[PDB]
Amino acid sequence: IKMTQTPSSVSAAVGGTVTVNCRASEDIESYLAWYQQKPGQPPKLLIYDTSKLASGVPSRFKGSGSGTQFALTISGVQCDDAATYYCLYGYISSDRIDFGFGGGTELVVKGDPVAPSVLIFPPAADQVATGTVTIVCVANKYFPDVTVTWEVDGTTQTTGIENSKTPQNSADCTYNLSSTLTLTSTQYNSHKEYTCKVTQGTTSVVQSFNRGD
Amino acid sequence: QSLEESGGDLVKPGASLTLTCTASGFSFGWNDYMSWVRQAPGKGLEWIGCIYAGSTYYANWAKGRLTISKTSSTAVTLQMTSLTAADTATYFCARGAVTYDGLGGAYLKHFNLWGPGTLVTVSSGQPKAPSVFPLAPCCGDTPSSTVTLGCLVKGYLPEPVTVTWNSGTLTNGVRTFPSVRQSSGLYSLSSVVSVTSPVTCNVAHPATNTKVDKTVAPST
């Protein structure tokens, strides 16, 4: 058995409607369930038996389909609905086992646009002695996505950058982002100006510090 | 009623590991197919197998290298052998209800109860406690009304670390970002918090039995 969910990522404005699809490689009648998972939490049952709502789930969630094609329709989407959705089918017996999750569909909930405030943090004084130094830059409460660029004395950096993005805010649909630049102690004393540029379309914000001060 | 998984640990390639799923506020009975489910970091859900609480059923990729058992009316186990990096994941236990077919088969109706999950990390590295560094605006700047401070939690293994501020009393304005795995296999994360007028980040790393408190102040 194979559960194919297409597409892997969907988006809709707050209040709008989205449909997540799940296709089955065989005929599975009606024994399909839907699940919601937010980062760091176990999955939560939304629907089972194709369309039966679970205890406590709003009617804005709607099961559908039969046989080979099923769908989950979310009407009146809110920022709290931003998450990943999985279909699931399972059959067991003494000779044949057919179990499978779908690959999952991520929902990005489009909310009100917000430009990011940016912060740079020079390394604490006790980092340099360790041979390695880490510079953190943060982009706070924004939507839609941003891109981050690192400049050390006007030279764009391309190695040693890790970026990490929070899930969408439950009430606000906004993101937060950290961007970390790691260098060797020698590399860091070798240069002076360290700058972090966050770009959200046509707008951009830049923060900087200079090692000496 | 609730479920709690235990046993997740850092282990070397080739090792075996047993995880346990303990029930609270109910017992494993003849209406329960207890399933194990796992999720590799940033990937999708993958069914492992299930045991009838009143005989076992494994996925094709699992049958032959792991075992599910029922020890008591409160506990079931997952015994995994020859672990590899592809087994690094969160392992959940879920209580399943089935709809019988009448011909000797059963269809999974739903998983209505999930434990919070336990983390299995398969790597050759040793456990390593994080280094904690204060995040503060550069000293050569004029301080302002408000200020955002934080802690960098760097170079630890295995996950997770937990981060509180002022022992849990400080929550509004806190952003703790998702851990990122670096080239070296170690993890890192940061936590920032916004305030006006010091503050203390509390970092717990259970797997090294470590707790670190760093008091952060803006540097002038």
Structure tokens at B164: 């509180």
Q: Are A175 and A145 in contact (CB under 8 A)?
A: yes
B49: closest chain A residue by CA: A99
Distance from CA of A17 to the nearest CA of B (A): 24
Whether B131 and A130 lie within 8 Å, measured CB to CB: yes
User: What is the experimental method?
Assistant: X-ray
Q: Note the residue count of chain A.
A: 213
Among the candidates B124, B140, B166, a domain finishes at B124
Residue A159 near residue A121 (C-beta atoms within 8 A): no
Q: For B44, which residue in chain A has the nearest alpha carbon? A: A103
Final residue before a domain boundary, out of B104, B124, B144: B124
A97/chain B closest Cα distance in angstroms: 7
Same domain? B49 vs B132: no
Measured CA to CA, the distance from residue A141 to residue A94 in angstroms comes to: 53
**B188, HSE (Cβ side, Cα atoms, 13 Å):** 24
The tally of domains found in chain B comes to 2
Residues of A with Cβ-Cβ distance to B175 under 8 angstroms: 138, 140, 166, 176
A95 → chain B, closest CA residue:
B105
Interface test with B, best of A48, A99, A128 (most B CBs within 10 A): A99
Residue B120 and residue B12 share a domain: yes
- Residue A178 CA, distance from chain mean position: 14
B154 touches chain A (CB under 8 A): yes
CA dihedral A136, A140, A145, A148 (to 10 degrees): -30
Taking a C-beta distance cutoff of 8 angstroms, is the pair B53, B23 a contact?
no
Task: Tell whether omega for the bond before A123 is within 30 degrees of 0, i.e. cis.
Answer: no
Please name the residue of chain B whose CA is at the shortest distance from the CA of residue A122. Answer: B138
| Range of the structural domain that residue B23 is part of | 2-124
Which H or E run includes A185? helix A185-190
Of A90, A121, A162, the CB nearest to B180: A162
Residue with tokens 């830049």: A206
- Please tell me what resolution, in angstroms, this structure has: 2.3
> Is B61 near chain A, with CB under 8 Å?
no
Q: In whole angstroms, what is the distance from residue A59 CA to residue A56 CA?
A: 9
Q: Which of A5, A86, A91, A92 to probe the B interface (max B CBs under 10 A)?
A: A92
The token pair at A148 is 């981050």
In CATH, what number is assigned to the domain containing residue B159?
A: 2.60.40.10
User: Which domain-ending residue is among B124, B156, B188?
Assistant: B124
Would you mind telling me the total number of residues written for chain B in this entry?
220
> Is B85 found in the same domain as B8?
yes
Residues B17 and B113 reside in one and the same domain: yes
For residue A61, which of A83, A38, A81, A39 has the smallest C-alpha distance? Answer: A81
Q: Which residues of B touch A48 (CB under 8 A)?
A: 109-110
**Cα distance between residue A141 and residue B174, in whole Å:** 12
Judgement on whether residues B91 and B142 belong to the same structural domain of the protein:
no
Supply angle C-alpha B183, A189, A117, rounded to 5: 70
Paired tokens of A30: 């009606």
A140 and B175 in contact by Cβ < 8 A? Answer: yes
Query: B40 and B103 in one domain?
Result: yes
Please give the Cα distance from A15 to B181 (Å, whole number).
36
The DSSP secondary structure of chain B, one letter per residue, reads -EEEEE---EE-TT--EEEEEEEESS---TT-EEEEEEE-TTS-EEEEEEEE---EEE-TTTBTTEEEEE-SSSEEEEEE-S--GGG-EEEEEEEEEEEE-SSS-EEEEEEEEE---EEEEE-SSPPBPPEEEEE---TTS---SSEEEEEEEEEEBSS--EEEEGGGTB-TTEEEPPPEE-TTS-EEEEEEEEE---EEEEEEEGGGTEEEEEEE----
Asked if B26 is an interface residue toward chain A (Cβ–Cβ < 8 A), one would say no
Q: Domains in chain A, ordered, with CATH? A: 1-111 (no CATH), 112-213 (2.60.40.10)
